[PDB]
RNA sequence: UAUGUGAUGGAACCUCUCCGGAUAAUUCUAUCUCUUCUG
């Protein structure tokens, strides 16, 4: 079968690289940033 | 805690009346699970 073109977009590489796997904290609120990766579009596109 | 020439209290059955009863086949097929990234 033919794979399609999925994983060399950017957002799959940065949600991929970005593991974050500790430094969460369950209490108080949080300090993130929408950082798109150079898309600008619309809503909910984005990673905290 | 008596008071004295006079105490059958051994002088009285907690007795009598009332179905732990009624109802129930030890039986058996449709899913489960939510976030995917422009496609």
Do not use: C
């Not at 994983?7 to 369950?26: C, Q």
Request: glycine residues 2%; charged residues 30%; aromatic residues 8%.
């Amino acid at each position: 079968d033919v794979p399609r073109y999925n994983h060399p977009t950017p957002t799959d590489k940065m949600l991929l690289s970005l593991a974050a796997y500790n430094r969460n904290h369950k209490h108080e609120n949080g300090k993130a940033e929408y950082r798109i990766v150079k898309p600008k579009h619309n809503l909910k596109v984005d990673f905290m």
